[PDB]
Write a protein that binds this ligand. Structure first.
Ligand code: MG
Length: 151
């Protein structure tokens, strides 16, 4: 049971993050903005809001559900197996990042189209869930909606 979220700023840029060197699974790997696990009795929406605060010190708009049926298994460079129920969301940040370096060792604000081109060309350089989520046609169209400038 898990969630993933793709965050955009009001200008429509996508935030990509790099998992800290100390993460158990996929340490050091570039990936979409945030992922995690809801707590007992917590909605996925509220888990997203909570983890964005926790890993990125940031506030967000109401998370939109963009890939509710996403579920996968993937094995990490060290063999850690992960099998997850992981509905995907998108939101916009409404405040500045304040980075938790226990979780995130780097990040970049990027153009979605560049990120998609990188994912499509060199998927091995990104976490496997970032790639499997972004290559879903419907989810990808939702990411594109979040690139619009919001004034
Ligand atoms: Mg996380």
């Amino acid at each position: 049971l898990a969630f993933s979220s793709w965050l955009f700023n009001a200008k429509g840029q996508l935030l990509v993050t790099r998992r800290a060197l100390s993460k158990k699974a996929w340490p050091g790997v570039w990936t979409n903005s945030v992922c995690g696990h809801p707590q007992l009795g917590e909605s996925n929406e509220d888990a997203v809001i909570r983890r964005c605060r926790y890993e990125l010190g940031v506030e967000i708009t109401p998370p939109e559900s963009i890939y509710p049926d996403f579920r996968a298994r993937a094995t990490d460079p060290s063999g850690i197996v992960e099998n997850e129920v992981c509905p995907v969301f998108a939101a916009r940040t409404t405040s500045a990042l304040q980075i938790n370096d226990d979780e995130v060792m780097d990040y970049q604000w990027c153009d979605l189209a560049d990120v998609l081109h990188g994912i499509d060309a060199t998927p091995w350089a990104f976490s496997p869930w970032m790639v499997m989520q972004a290559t879903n046609r419907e989810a990808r169209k939702r990411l594109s909606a979040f690139t619009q400038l919001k004034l």
